[PDB]
Each structure stands twice: as C-alpha cells, then as structure tokens.
Amino acid sequence: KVYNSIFDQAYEIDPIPYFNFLRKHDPVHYEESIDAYFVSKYKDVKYILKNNDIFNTKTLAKRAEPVMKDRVLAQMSGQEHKSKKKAILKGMTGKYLENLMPILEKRTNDIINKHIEKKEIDIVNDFGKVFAVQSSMDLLGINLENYEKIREWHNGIAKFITSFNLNDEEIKYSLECSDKLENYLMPLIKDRKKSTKDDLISILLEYKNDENSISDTEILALSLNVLLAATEPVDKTLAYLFYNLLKNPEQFESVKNNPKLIKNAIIETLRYNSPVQLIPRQVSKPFIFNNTELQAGDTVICMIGSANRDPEAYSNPDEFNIHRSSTSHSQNLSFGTGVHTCVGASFSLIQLEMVAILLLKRLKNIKLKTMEITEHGIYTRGPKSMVISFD
Ligand code: HEM
C-alpha cells in the first residue's frame, strides 16, 4: 500500500529524503512492524507534545521498566512530576551548577591532555563518549573509578530503550547490564543516605513528599533516568557541532571571531542534526490529523528531526546556518516541548558551550580529517567517528 518505510535500509543511512516525502505525502504514517504512526510535520509534533492529556507517556513504561527497575519521570504526572522534575533540576542549577562546572572543565582538559601530543582527536570516540558519561557521573555523585564499566552498562541499557525489534539474546544482555548497574549503584545510594554529599543522588534522598520519601529502588530508577538521559545526546551533539562548523568554514570563522555565536551554533546543530530523533506517545481517545484516524491505544512517534527541518517552520531548513534569526524561524523541538520538555536543556547548552570553547582555545588551527561522516541510529542518532587534527 505504502512502499516508503522508516525501516528501509536507506532510511538509517540518510533519512532526509524520507522526512521530505512523509511531510508532503504521508504526515501521519503507519508502520505495521511496530504498530505505530510516525508524525513528521512541525505543527503536528508540537500539537502532540503540548497536549499531554490526549497523547500521554504510558507508552514509555514497558519500553523502560525492564531496565529502570522502578518508575521514571516520564511516567509521572501532576504535582508529583512537577516536584520531582524540580528536584532533578536543583542538581544542575544554583550552587550545584557552580560546583559542577569547574569539575567538567577538569574532565575536559584531562581528556584533551591525553590526546594533545598526537595532534588529532576523535570528537566521538576519544572525547564525547568519555566526557559524556563522566559528566553524568559527576552530576549524580558517582566516583569516576569504574567509569569504563559504567559506559558499557549504559550502552546496554540505552540500546534496549532506543531499539525497536531486539532479539532474545540482545534483550537478555541489556537486562544483565541493568542488574550490574543496579548492583553497583544501590550500595552508594545506601551510603549516601548516611553521609550526605552535595550531589543529585543526595538531593533525591533528601526529597520530602510532605513527610514521605522516594524508595531506594525509585531513587535508583531516577538515578538511572538521569544517567541515560544526560549521556547519550552529549556525545552526538559535540561531534555534529564541530563537523558542521568545519564543513562551513565561513561560519566556523565567525564563531572564532565572536565566541558569543557558539550558543547559536549549538542550537542550530540541535535543530539540523537532532540527536534525539523520536519521541513516542500513546493516544488516549479518538483523534484525527489531516485524513488519518487514530484510536485510543494507538502509538504515535514524533519525528523531531523531520519537524526541525519543516519548511513551514524554517526557511531553507536543510541548510546549516548559525545566524538564523526570528524569513521564517521557530523554536526547535530538539528538547521537546510541553509538560515533559527536557529538564536538562539549560545545563546542556552551558556544558556544551564550555567544552566547545575549551576545545577551540587549546586545539589550534583545527582541521577536519573525517571528510564524510557516517551516521547510525534512528531513535538516537550521531556520527560513528569525527576526527580532527590540530597543531
Ligand atoms: C543535548 C542534550 C539533550 C537533548 C538533545 C535532550 C533531549 C530531550 C528530549 C527531546 C526530551 C523529551 C522526551 C519526551 O518528551 O518524551 C528530554 C527529556 C528529558 N531529558 Fe533531556 N536532553 C538532553 C540532555 C539532558 C540532560 C543533560 C539531562 C540531565 C539529567 C536530561 C534529562 C532529561 C529528563 C529527566 C527528561 C524527562 C523530562 C520529563 O519527563 O519531564 N537530558 N530530553
């Protein structure tokens, strides 16, 4: 009936032609392999995410609980969601943020110092994947000793969350990974209870729901939620940022000349190469977009990358342009919108600006070595490698 499928081999290699086709010819597109509709236009994605009652987050509960071990922020609503969301934000704002950022500068310079004498560095594999997990561990309060194993287990859990047809042996490994992370993490939650530090895990322990407190298994689930949420997109976005700047030498120079433009470059990178590509919701009642009827219990999947390149929301949407100013410009959907918008958005922009500015300060006469990237992932998406040389 319809011959263009999200799961075509061509899609993961280059989804942009698919974005353009779907928005123009099938904006609410059914995929029988996973019994879900993919939503490609900016207007409809925005509407879905802004109407949490019609499109709720219970979808993200069977695709999460197996590894998260208890309730995650997305599953919550009402006063509980708002107050716990505020608790998490407390660990990346105020005094917690003032303390964290010097530490993330250290993380960054320690990685740089590991590679500076080789005169090249892989922004994906040498920097991004290491910095991303370490920064998440520092946010939480986890000692960097076992960070290599933390990365391994994180990868296994993330794969279960971001995948669509896992086989039985792949599933069993993702679960093992989450037990090892639980086995590792629960003892530190039990130690943090007594001696209390100034980190996010202690914030969660001091939480007061009137006079109640989240169970340890729920602190673990929320701690795992932050670990997964903060790690995955940081690597990808840093790589995309430097790739796009170097592929547009004139814009790279504008940033070098006015470093303030770096914030805009990060935002444009998040729009152009959205590292979180899909956001699922469950339909709570009969509903219709364009011609396409949806029923209660159906699953819709917002295509963030498609929406962020919608010509109805941006002029020249498929061009990287750090100087976009609000013929047509909209707020991008890379952090979502509405009730469940990313709690880490402001911290992410601050952390990414710090790292980019330090890389630009210490690596002189940067030159691209990976002339053509190859990207992988349809749920979370980024380059396999992104190597740069420097003096
Ligand atoms: C460039 C970096 C990041 C991007 C692109 C990103 C993207 C997103 C998106 C698109 C959502 C919405 C998911 C939905 O509506 O179902 C989300 C939610 C969330 N993100 Fe991020 N995120 C990033 C960094 C972070 C960081 C650093 C944290 C730190 C803890 C974090 C924690 C969360 C949490 C807890 C949620 C759930 C929000 C809620 O349910 O109210 N993320 N993120």
Ligand SMILES: NCc1ccc2[nH]ccc2c1
């Ligand atoms: N907070 C960003 C984010 C959103 C969805 C995700 N699915 C797996 C990891 C992950 C991270």
